[PDB]
Amino acid sequence: SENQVTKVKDTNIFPYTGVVAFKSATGFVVGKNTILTNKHVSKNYKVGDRITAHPNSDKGNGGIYSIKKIINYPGKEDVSVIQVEERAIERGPKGFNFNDNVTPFKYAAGAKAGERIKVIGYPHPYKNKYVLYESTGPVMSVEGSSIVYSAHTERGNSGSPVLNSNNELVGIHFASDVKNDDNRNAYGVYFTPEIKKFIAENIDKG
Numbered sequence: 001s002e003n004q005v006t007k008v009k010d011t012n013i014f015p016y017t018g019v020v021a022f023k024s025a026t027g028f029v030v031g032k033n034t035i036l037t038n039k040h041v042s043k044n045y046k047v048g049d050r051i052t053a054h055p056n057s058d059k060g061n062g063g064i065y066s067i068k069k070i071i072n073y074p075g076k077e078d079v080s081v082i083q084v085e086e087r088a089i090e091r092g093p094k095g096f097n098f099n100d101n102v103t104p105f106k107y108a109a110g111a112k113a114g115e116r117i118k119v120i121g122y123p124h125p126y127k128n129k130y131v132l133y134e135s136t137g138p139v140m141s142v143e144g145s146s147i148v149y150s151a152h153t154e155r156g157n158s159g160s161p162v163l164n165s166n167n168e169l170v171g172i173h174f175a176s177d178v179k180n181d182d183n184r185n186a187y188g189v190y191f192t193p194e195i196k197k198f199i200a201e202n203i204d205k206g
């Protein structure tokens with residue numbers, strides 16, 4: 001089957017440099033000192049909790065950062081903006097500045113049923129290891145703030161970016177059908193104008 005799930009060997013190149021890890025799920029960078037995740041992920045975390053930038057399976061990462069603010073979208077969609085303190089609590093390879101160690105994504109022009117997407121995140125938490133995966137499959141439908149795709153995802157993928165074939169952002173993963181078969185739908189939030197505005201409003205001003 002051409003819908004594949006594979007481990008990402010090196011996480012220090014684009015697009016993996018846009019992805020972050022919480023203790024047990026995923027997020028991704030949207031702007032200066034600012035990450036996007038799901039509300040069902042951010043509910044587990046508080047001010048002072050830590051996130052790790054694109055950790056690899058061999059103790060390497062882009063630094064460890066402290067949460068400074070959590071802003072939950074007041075609408076129904078499963079979207080949460082998290083701001084971090086700019087200076088790392090564990091230096092990244094490109095220095096202490098969060099923004100020097102990570103890369104935000106460009107929004108795609110849109111998405112259509114049938115196109116290939118890629119969900120990038122940490123599907124399963126491990127004792128003292130982070131294992132980044134990429135999972136591919138087709139878009140099934142796009143309607144309003146919903147994007148549905150048939151790519152394998154697990155619990156830890158909550159908050160993962162959903163990218164098109166050219167690494168442009170089409171959605172944020174939040175849920176999946178629990179069925180055992182391969183013809184299983186996964187669900188993301190599609191970036192409608194009011195969700196894009198909410199995110200833009202809540203990027204750290206500096």
Ligand code: NA
Nearest residue numbers: 024025041044
């Ligand atoms: Na979590």
